[PDB]
Amino acid sequence: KQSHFFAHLSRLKLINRWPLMRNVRTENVSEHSLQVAMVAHALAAIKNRKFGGNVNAERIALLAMYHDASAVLTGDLPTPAQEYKAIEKIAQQKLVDMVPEELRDIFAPLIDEHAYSDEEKSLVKQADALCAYLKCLEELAAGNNEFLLAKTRLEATLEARRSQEMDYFMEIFVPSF
């Protein structure tokens, strides 16, 4: 009768990120996911507006809201391979199976990373790395040089995932960090 779906989702704010490092301020997956949603939405809208995009930006926000949701079952694994992809995908399916059946098909394509189109997938992973970068920028602005190397390698991930909408974002929103 009842679904534990939201009780489990409610746990996201307990799962802390960047564990291998001293954090001036602990970020949890809840804070992370909202920032990714906001950035991923901003990036989609920019693409649409200036760069010929035709992506559903509202949808992209909702995918970003959910992109790390399976952490409530697995915990957070620090980035630094095929097996983790495994558990995570098992974890995402288990979450999906908690949703009442009559709603399953609304939630499955938000939770299950297989469902992301090529362009949705790009935008969300660009937002994710941005947000990870912005974290490094915050920590460093606080004097915390443990995020130094993480900054550098994230600069590599960003250039790999480079786009016009990312360049706009960087030049326009990031320097204030």
Ligand X SMILES: Nc1ncnc2c1ncn2[C@H]1C[C@H](O)[C@@H](COP(=O)(O)O)O1
Tell me the per-residue interface mask from 66 to 95 with Co ion, x by CB under 5 A, - otherwise.
--x---------------------------
Judged by CB under 6 A, which of 30, 61, 65, 68 binds ligand X? 68
In angstroms, what CA-CA distances link 113 with 64, 85, 96, 172? Answer: 10, 10, 12, 29
Q: Could you tell me how many residues of this chain bind Co ion (CB under 5 A)? A: 2
Mark 81-120 with x for binding to ligand X (rule: CB under 6 A) and - for no binding.
----------------------------------------
Minimum CB distance to ligand X smaller for 128 or for 139: 128
Q: Which residue has the tokens 């706009």?
A: 168
Please state, in angstroms and rounded to a whole number, the distance separating the CA atoms of residues 70 and 12: 9
- Indicate the burial class of 31 (C-beta count within 10 angstroms; 0-12, 13-18, 19 or more): middle
Minimum Å gap between C-beta 99 and Co ion is: 21
Q: Output the smallest distance, CB 68 to Co ion, in A.
A: 4
Residue-by-residue DSSP string for 69-90: TTHHHH-PPP---HHHHHHHHH
Cβ 1 to a copy of itself, closest distance in Å?
8
Piece of the chain touching ligand X by CB under 6 A; list 44-52, 71-79, 96-104, 159-167: 71-79
The owner of tokens 């480079």 is 162
26 is in an annotated binding site: no
Closest by CA to 3, choosing from 106, 76, 80, is: 106
Tell me if 76 is assigned to a ligand binding site: yes
- Cα–Cα distance between 66 and 82 in angstroms, integer? 21
112 is in an annotated binding site: no
Please report, as ranges, the residues that interact with Co ion according to CB under 5 A.
Answer: 68, 128
Annotated binding residues, as ranges? 17-18, 32, 67-68, 76-79, 128
